[PDB]
Ligand SMILES: NC(=O)c1ccc[n+]([C@@H]2O[C@H](COP(=O)([O-])OP(=O)(O)OC[C@H]3O[C@@H](n4cnc5c(N)ncnc54)[C@H](OP(=O)(O)O)[C@@H]3O)[C@@H](O)[C@H]2O)c1
Ligand SMILES: NC(=O)c1ccc[n+]([C@@H]2O[C@H](COP(=O)([O-])OP(=O)(O)OC[C@H]3O[C@@H](n4cnc5c(N)ncnc54)[C@H](OP(=O)(O)O)[C@@H]3O)[C@@H](O)[C@H]2O)c1
Ligand SMILES: C[C@@H]1CN(c2ccc(F)cc2C(F)(F)F)CCN1S(=O)(=O)c1ccc(C(N)=O)cc1Cl
């Protein structure tokens with residue numbers, strides 16, 4: 001990690017992809033990234049909402065802003081979106097995996113279809129994008145940024161499929177970080193553990209069932225960008241203070257030393 | 262609190278029961294006088310296991326062969342097994358897709374197969390079995406690993422699938438508490454075990470102390486009989502000590518009333 005204080009200029013001229021960027025934290029990240037003079041390529045499914053975002057980005061001072069629309073249910077699209085984004089920017093420094101299949105609050109009864117879709121979109125596609133991007137990311141000694149959640153560190157009811165997929169990201173990407181450590185690949189992996197953030201999709205899905213405070217999505221977004229710029233292993237963000245301090249697991253840090261050899 | 266008589270006449274399914282810990286588990290069940298239905302892809306080996314379970318004092322022993330890459334087989338395998346045994350008390354999810362030790366190298370197929378077999382089939386099996394278990398106030402036992410709790414290199418796809426199990430099955434465990442479904446869920450976090458397949462995979466690259474699979478198998482069954490939420494089993498007691506996660510227990514307890 002960059003033993004250093006975050007500077008907005010760290011992101012100037014940086015060639016950055018942001019997925020699920022048509023709303024919520026994805027949008028806000030893209031805007032922040034634009035104000036810092038980044039080249040931004042964004043994706044999502046709705047081209048309409050995507051274009052609007054691209055408008056707002058160019059004004060803000062984005063060195064370049066582009067969009068590509070498609071669904072990450074389709075892995076062939078996943079792959080091509082990254083090569084195409086590479087084109088539009090002339091390389092890739094930071095890859096921001098953020099999109100998720102749309103979810104709500106339910107007791108799991110029989111939806112094996114929602115479980116697979118969550119696994120494919122929330123997780124597998126992240127792996128596809130990662131493979132697509134790794135080449136460019138090695139040359140630029142860039143960064144992968146992976147947005148996760150409290151539900152991907154601890155267990156909560158009514159978010160089973162979602163939690164499995166976030167847990168799966170932890171498992172896969174943490175495991176990959178260590179491989180890059182051994183094989184000396186200089187590409188940072190940052191896992192971001194977000195508590196409730198006030199996106200319009202979250203507050204819609206939380207209404208009635210859950211009473212808890214939502215942290216701003218604007219600071220949430222900056223915080224994720226900083227964690228990746230500074231190449232941290234993990235980032236925690238949550239309105240509370242209780243929360244953010246327990247997330248770190250030193251005993252885990254301890255056992256991961258058994259391999260060291 | 263545990264005593265072998267707990268599993269006498271209990272109806273039990275063991276998956277991946279043709280080799281390693283799965284075979285050992287079926288054998289313990291047989292001694293204990295359980296009704297057992299076992300599975301794997303190979304009928305030849307399942308046959309050998311079934312006759313052995315009988316010699317060991319099994320109240321009943323039968324195999325059903327098929328691949329858990331097929332969610333239709335998985336889902337019918339449970340219907341068929343349950344109807345055979347007249348019900349079901351315990352479901353022991355244990356099988357995995359063939360895995361070896363290598364650096365992730367763009368092999369997305371392996372990552373997906375691992376999610377399919379290691380994680381998703383466990384869910385289909387569970388859905389299929391839930392009505393019978395609700396009826397018997399039975400139990401689901403999920404066999405996981407250290408890589409399902411912590412990050413290691415050379416096991417990326419595998420860890421992903423096992424982490425998946427923890428996040429999914431712990432989440433549903435909370436759900437049953439609250440919807441008063443009396444079906445226990447046990448996650449078993451096992452370090453290295455001396456199964457032929459583990460031993461062939463983990464060498465001669467490195468090697469730590471392998472605990473014995475007969476012990477492991479039994480601790481898994483015990484964990485399940487006693488309805489515990491997690492079971493840890495490793496060669497080193499220092500390792501077992503470090504597996505537990507109190508911060509998590511608190512974050513889940515805190516946000517327990519958070520609310521409804
Ligand atoms: N906000 C929170 O309370 C909270 C809490 C914990 C974790 N997180 C994490 O934060 C991240 C963003 O959350 P959010 O609430 O901001 O998300 P969101 O508002 O629901 O939107 C995420 C984006 O993903 C896109 N998307 C949906 N399906 C897609 C698909 N099949 N292929 C490609 N893109 C797709 C959506 O755009 P389209 O509909 O146009 O496709 C959307 O822009 C997620 O990774 C989430 O897990 C958020
Ligand atoms: N042994 C260890 O060092 C270790 C460490 C940590 C965790 N674990 C956990 O312990 C459990 C058992 O491990 P193990 O070492 O005992 O495994 P194993 O003996 O090598 O084999 C597991 C079983 O799964 C079956 N199987 C393979 N592919 C299948 C498929 N596609 N569909 C249905 N069944 C299939 C195999 O039978 P067929 O080939 O005939 O299909 C076999 O009976 C696993 O969940 C593993 O994650 C083991
Ligand atoms: C309920 C929220 C938002 N959610 C989310 C995000 C984006 C969406 F689009 C939809 C959702 C969801 F709510 F429907 F799941 C994902 C899951 N979580 S979370 O991990 O941020 C979380 C935070 C705090 C607590 C707590 N009780 O302290 C519990 C949880 Cl699960």
Ligand SMILES: C[C@@H]1CN(c2ccc(F)cc2C(F)(F)F)CCN1S(=O)(=O)c1ccc(C(N)=O)cc1Cl
Nearest residue numbers: 258360361362406407408413451452453458459462
């Ligand atoms: C290597 C073993 C056995 N393995 C396994 C089991 C059954 C199989 F069939 C195949 C494998 C595998 F090794 F090939 F993945 C699954 C993964 N693990 S483990 O999680 O028990 C483990 C134990 C100790 C260390 C450590 N070095 O401190 C690391 C790990 Cl990942």
